[PDB]
């Protein structure tokens, strides 16, 4: 209540405070507790193999230099005080581009406690790398992590833990990605060794399951409809050369445009995906339908009836095998 | 352990310290050791002729002004101390855009040693130029370098070396580019002379080998399939003018769309690439197939049978010569 008294207390705390030295410098490591509140996952990019996360990132530690007596309150201080305090040198090892939000002020909090516990909160948006295995795309499940580490302090000097264990990360239910469901999240803690020493690591990972629905509609269904269209040829008279050759060409060429378009939406991976296998199967069907007419055409100068049954039935077999293997 | 003692020692080190003067100013050059830990190569752009690298960049040197006694520890200091110290004026001569990561703090380390050795680490993402020879594209091998130099200090004042020789750069095995394999990396050291004097240079280069698989699927296979499609014409009766002319047109025009699309994905180079040579060969085949019908059409008002053998066989020869020359 007495602001001169509080001002005096805080001034005394910061008098001769050396930001260069961690708490308990030269002694046992400072234990830093971390908890995350997820705000959003804005984007997941296959082409860039990354995702964009917004979170409230909070760090908990004790700095005995900041302990104060005679005030039974927790002091919430203006965020600019953070520039006069030691804070951990935490970074995101797999981040590509990150920033602290700055409107209307730097989205930063400092709360002091009488025992010298410092609560430091930041609102961060990060684009973080996530190598994806697209062999089963778009029936794939991905593991995207966020790796949290101390930049310069080894485990001799700093230690990390998930504050609250399995409850340290909240808001996973808020994530609303149209193309993915969050199946699971996990929290891991370990030490990572480099040439410069052993460093504390915390890892947050999510399991993302792609929703098929968009792909059924966008790629699978057009390919099915083109393949069915190709079969119309078999019910046309063999003398209708222009009509039946037109059907063959248009379906074959449409399947090429669909294939090439699709792979321009994705990174230039050297392996065959699940969707590639489907499109290649559909291409073979429609190409053989045109070749069937060439064969009919070739001899006329029963085969159509046999084509009318064998082609739809074989396509059913193809689909059965495909969707069983991958679903 | 005694933080007042450590604070006193460090304050004494920085008392009267002149950041303007290099260590041993006016004396022999300061030897700066450099080691790199590669985190990622995010992107390689043919259109922009550049690549994006993330690395941990560390500099080693001795500053006798910072030597301290009576403390048998290496002091890890808050990264903000870097602003009160001399550091080398290292830059990347072929970089296009670079930044030091800033979340949650500037990704920077300072470690002092009792003898006055300073360890200075930065986490940097750089987009760096890489002129590519695309004459054999996409069967090409590229050499992309990173050129490290002192901006303002000559070899009279500063010297660079790879700390650890051939082990100074780690993490090359981590690089996972879908479209490239890292064949080799090399470390070079030399002096570079400009009008303003001789400057120390370190060069890190990689040899990148393009993976063919994507290109086989995306461009080579469609072109093969269009060329085969063109041959169907030769099995159609010569009276089927609409059918056979349709085949000629559609294949010719499809090969033009494939060509023009492809070169819109690449820089506006004035020379012919390997892929251009293939597409031009395929164009000639399908164009001649249509011209073959014009010739048949021209006289009807044996040639088809001779076309049925000579065209596929010639395409096989064309492919044999091509893939031998380039693979």
């Amino acid at each position: 209540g007495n602001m001169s008294f509080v001002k005096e207390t805080v001034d005394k705390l910061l008098k001769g405070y050396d930001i260069r030295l961690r708490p308990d410098f030269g002694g046992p490591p400072v234990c830093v507790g971390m908890n995350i509140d997820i705000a959003s996952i804005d984007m997941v990019s296959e082409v860039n193999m990354d995702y964009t996360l917004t979170m409230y990132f909070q760090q908990y530690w004790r700095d005995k230099r900041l302990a104060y007596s005679g005030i039974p309150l927790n002091l919430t201080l203006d965020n600019r005080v953070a520039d006069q305090l030691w804070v951990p040198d935490t970074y995101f090892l797999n981040d590509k581009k990150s920033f602290v939000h700055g409107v209307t002020v730097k989205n930063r909090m400092i709360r002091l406690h009488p025992d010298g516990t410092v609560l430091y909160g930041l609102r961060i948006t990060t684009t973080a790398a996530c190598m994806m295995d697209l062999r089963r795309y778009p029936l794939d499940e991905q593991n995207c992590t966020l790796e949290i580490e101390s930049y310069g302090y080894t485990t001799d000097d700093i230690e990390f833990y998930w504050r609250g264990g399995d409850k340290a990360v909240t808001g996973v239910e808020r994530i609303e990605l149209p193309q993915f469901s969050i199946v699971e999240h996990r929290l891991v803690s370990r030490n990572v060794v480099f040439a410069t020493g052993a460093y504390p690591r915390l890892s947050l990972s999510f399991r993302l399951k792609r929703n098929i629905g968009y792909f059924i509609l966008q790629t699978y269904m057009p390919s099915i409809l083109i393949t069915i269209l190709s079969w119309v040829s078999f019910w046309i008279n063999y003398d209708a050369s222009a009509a039946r050759v037109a059907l063959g060409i248009t379906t074959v060429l449409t399947m090429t445009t669909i294939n090439t378009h699709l792979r321009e939406t994705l990174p230039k991976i050297p392996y065959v995906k699940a969707i590639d296998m489907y499109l290649m199967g559909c291409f073979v069907f429609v190409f053989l339908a045109l070749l069937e007419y060439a064969f009919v055409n070739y001899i006329f100068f029963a085969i159509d009836r046999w084509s009318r049954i064998v082609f739809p039935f074989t396509f059913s077999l193809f689909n059965l095998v495909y969707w069983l293997y991958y679903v | 352990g005694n933080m007042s003692f450590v604070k006193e020692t460090v304050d004494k080190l920085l008392k009267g310290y002149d950041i303007r003067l290099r260590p041993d100013f006016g004396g022999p050059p300061v030897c700066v050791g450099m080691n790199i830990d590669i985190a990622s190569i995010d992107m390689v752009s043919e259109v922009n002729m550049d690549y994006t690298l993330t690395m941990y960049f560390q500099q080693y040197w001795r500053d006798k002004r910072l030597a301290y006694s009576g403390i048998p520890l290496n002091l890890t200091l808050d990264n903000r101390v870097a602003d009160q110290l001399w550091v080398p004026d290292t830059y990347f001569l072929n970089d296009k855009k670079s930044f030091v990561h800033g979340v949650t703090v500037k990704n920077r380390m300072i470690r002092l040693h009792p003898d006055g050795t300073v360890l200075y680490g930065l986490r940097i993402t750089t987009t760096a130029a890489c002129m590519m020879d695309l004459r054999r594209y996409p069967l090409d091998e590229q050499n992309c370098t990173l050129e490290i130099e002192s901006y303002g200090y000559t070899t009279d004042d500063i010297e660079f070396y790879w700390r650890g020789g051939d082990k100074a750069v780690t993490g090359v095995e981590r690089i996972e580019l879908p479209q490239f394999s890292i064949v080799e990396h090399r470390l070079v050291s030399r002096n570079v002379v400009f009008a303003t004097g001789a400057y120390p240079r370190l060069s890190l280069s990689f040899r990148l080998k393009r993976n063919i698989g994507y290109f086989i699927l995306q461009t080579y296979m469609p072109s093969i399939l269009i060329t085969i499609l063109s041959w169907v014409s030769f099995w159609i009766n010569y009276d089927a003018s609409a059918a056979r002319v349709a085949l000629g047109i559609t294949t010719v025009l499809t090969m033009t769309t494939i060509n023009t699309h492809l070169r819109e994905t690449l820089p506006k180079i004035p020379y012919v690439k390997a892929i251009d040579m293939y597409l031009m060969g395929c164009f000639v085949f399908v164009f001649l197939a249509l011209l073959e019908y014009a010739f048949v059409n021209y006289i009807f008002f044996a040639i088809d049978r001779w076309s049925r053998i000579v065209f596929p066989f010639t395409f096989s020869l064309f492919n044999l010569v091509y893939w031998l020359y380039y693979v």
Partner: nanobody
Amino acid sequence: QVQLVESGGGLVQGSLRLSCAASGHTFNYPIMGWFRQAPGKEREFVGAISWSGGSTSYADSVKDRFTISRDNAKNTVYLEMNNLKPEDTAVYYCAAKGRYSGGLYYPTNYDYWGQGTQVTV
């Protein structure tokens, strides 16, 4: 979750080919390492290979003697131990490293350890 079974050790006086067959989620663990533990001594780095690309690295002791490579079809890595020496007498272990799990050289960075073939010469 990776399982590693190694075979082809044994006792010889000579060229040898240790093999290391992986199965499971190998995508999350792109690097395979070879270690060896002599009796008494600490567990020691031999070499490592990336599954994708085959980017290889060796300890000095075995540089230009041993050669590692792999085949992704079988999910198999092999240490081709040529030009053997009586220093090369240890339980050779295979291990998998996570993508972000640190330096190649440090066995504590590795999670999934093979059984370990004893090799004496």
